[PDB]
Amino acid sequence: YTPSADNLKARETFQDDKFGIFIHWGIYSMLADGEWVMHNKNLNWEEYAKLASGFYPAKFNAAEWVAAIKASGAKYITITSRHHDGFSMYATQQSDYNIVDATPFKRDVIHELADECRKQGIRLHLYYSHLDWRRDDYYPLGRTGKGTGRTTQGKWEDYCAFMNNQLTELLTNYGLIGAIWFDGMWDKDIYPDGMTAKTWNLNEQYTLIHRLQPACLIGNNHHITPFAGEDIQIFERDLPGENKAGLSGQDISRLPLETCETMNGMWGYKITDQDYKSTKILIQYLVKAAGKNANLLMNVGPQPNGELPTVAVQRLREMGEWMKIYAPTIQGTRGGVVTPRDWGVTTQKGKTLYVHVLNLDDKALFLPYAGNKLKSAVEYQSRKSVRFIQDRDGILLKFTDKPHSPDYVLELTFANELPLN
């Protein structure tokens, strides 16, 4: 695999963007207990499908959704085109089990979002599930979905053809797509060959994607070393190199990095979970991702009435108030020469090092960097000079006051370009 020039350009734009919004939306939103409900509660596949003919998110408005997300500073959206329950949220001809043909809503919401994304300057990424709890040609089964009541059995080859045909539709009828974001491969990690490219038909899938849209980036949330043909690496609920959530532990690759996370605790809408992370924690999460050279893909789970959660919209609005001031210290940067520490992180652009102080009550900060003369240091907002001392061992900044919250940012200007590790 050798990525095309347009793909490489897209990789650079992706890393420049730093911030996107995940959207998990499907008929599981009506049950309002998370996107895994079909499997978690062993719901019969035919009984679950009866929900579709009552699905009517009357307050859905794509312009409003995209506007609310753009106001956060985010530059792209990743939306579930089809999740594990096998329901398609677009006008597919591969199955009548889709938002157009099976619901009274009768509208291709992916189409409506694509149109508004294009109009508002937001890039559209498509989540697509390798795992299927409904179709009988997902056979043999893996570790999940054994309780969903399937009693017939089809051919894996036909399931793979189904996925190819759906990917082809998604990359034909919805304009330029910035990425395909695969998920679910891990379902067969119980078999010896269950995590191979051959088992999952990855080479054919990736070649097909890049043939239709060479600039489209491919990610696959398998939590292991990226397969040839992937263009981004995904870390689920952890910064690269961290494993507090237990879904990581894999080596950091050379691909563009993206951490995904929930704003409350769940990907799909969950009516019992209204505990949304504070704006301060969300801002620091984005800064910490940027400081580890990674994008943040922050999730919102839309309601069954088609509105984004009001509290999520407020958080996004307030993140955008901060981005109004600080976006140039995050967007367009890469992880800085000083890797993340307990006090905070650094990001860099050209000859500029942004020092993001997130957690420090003292009035001095040692930076382990030498060999590049520091010409100036100022507070990013006020532009006041920051006193400093530099020698062959590093740089010591001194501050007039306690670092303020949520991020006390210093702009350091060096004589030479900062190295890219």
Residue 55: name its binding partner from a second copy, Zn ion, Na ion, none (Cβ under 5 to 8 Å by kind): a second copy
> In angstroms, rounded to a whole number, what is the distance separating the alpha carbons of residues 352 and 411?
7
Angle at 376 between CA 373 and CA 382, to 5 degrees: 155
**238: DSSP letter:** S
Q: How far is the CB of 284 from a second copy (least distance, A)?
A: 15
275: contact with a second copy by CB under 8 A:
no
Segment contacting Na ion (CB under 5 A): 205-213, 360-368, 372-380, 403-411? 360-368
What residues between 9 and 38 interact with a second copy by CB under 8 A?
Answer: 30-33
The only residue of 16, 64, 101, 115 in contact with Zn ion, by rule CB under 5 A: 115
Binding flag, residue 246, a second copy (CB under 8 A): no
The CA distances from residue 49 to 19, 34, 81, 145, 150, in Å, are 34, 16, 17, 15, 13
| Total chain residues near Zn ion (CB under 5 A) | 1
In the complex, least distance from residue 172 CB atom to a second copy, rounded to whole angstroms: 30
Q: Which stretch binds a second copy (CB under 8 A): 42-50, 61-69, 111-119, 251-259?
A: 42-50
Considering the complex, state which of residue 106 and residue 211 has its C-beta at the smaller distance from a second copy.
106
Would you count residue 51 as binding a second copy (CB under 8 A)? yes
2-10, 268-276, 345-353, 359-367 -> range binding Na ion (CB under 5 A): 359-367
- Decide: residue 297, CB within 10 A, 0-12 exposed, 13-18 middle, 19+ buried: buried
Shortest distance (Å) from residue 342 CB to Na ion: 8
Cβ pair 64, 316 in contact under 8 A: no
Length of the chain: 421
Binding footprint of a second copy, residue count (CB under 8 A): 44
CA torsion 237-238-239-241 (nearest 10°) is: -150
Closest to Zn ion by CB, 16 vs 169, is 169
Q: What is the dihedral of CA 49, 53, 59, 62, to 10 degrees?
A: 60
Comparing CB distances to a second copy, the nearer of 234 and 358 is 358
Question: For the CA atoms of 241, 34, 183, 256, what is the dihedral angle to 10 degrees?
Answer: -40
Supply angle C-alpha 31, 108, 82, rounded to 5: 55
What is the chain's percent helix, strand, coil content, to nearest 5? 30, 25, 50
Integer angstrom CA distances of residue 363 from 280, 284, 366: 21, 20, 10
Q: Quick check: 357 binds a second copy (CB under 8 A)?
A: no
In 76-202, the DSSP E strands lie at 76-82, 123-129, 179-183
362 is a site residue for Na ion (CB under 5 A): yes
Window contacting a second copy (CB under 8 A); options: 93-101, 126-134, 303-311, 372-380: 303-311
β-pairing, 19-23 vs 294-300, is parallel
Residue 404 burial by Cβ neighbours in a 10 Å radius (0-12, 13-18, 19+): exposed
Residue 393 binds: one of Zn ion, a second copy, Na ion, none (C-beta under 5 to 8 A by kind): a second copy
Q: Interface with a second copy includes 55 (CB under 8 A)?
A: yes
Annotation-wise, does 115 bind a ligand? yes
For Na ion, the closer of residues 275 and 362 by Cβ is 362
**396 lines the binding site for a second copy (CB under 8 A):** yes
Cβ neighbours of residue 92 closer than 8 Å, sequence gap 6 or more = 98, 166, 169
Q: Does 284 bind a second copy (CB under 8 A)?
A: no
Q: Which residues bind Na ion (CB under 5 A)?
A: 362
Q: Which residues are annotated binding-site positions for Zn(2+)?
A: 111, 115
Interface residues toward Zn ion, by CB under 5 A: 115
- The contact set with a second copy (CB under 8 A) reads 30-33, 41-44, 47-48, 50-59, 104, 271-272, 274, 303-307, 341-343, 359, 361-366, 368, 393-394, 396, 398
Binding residues: 111, 115
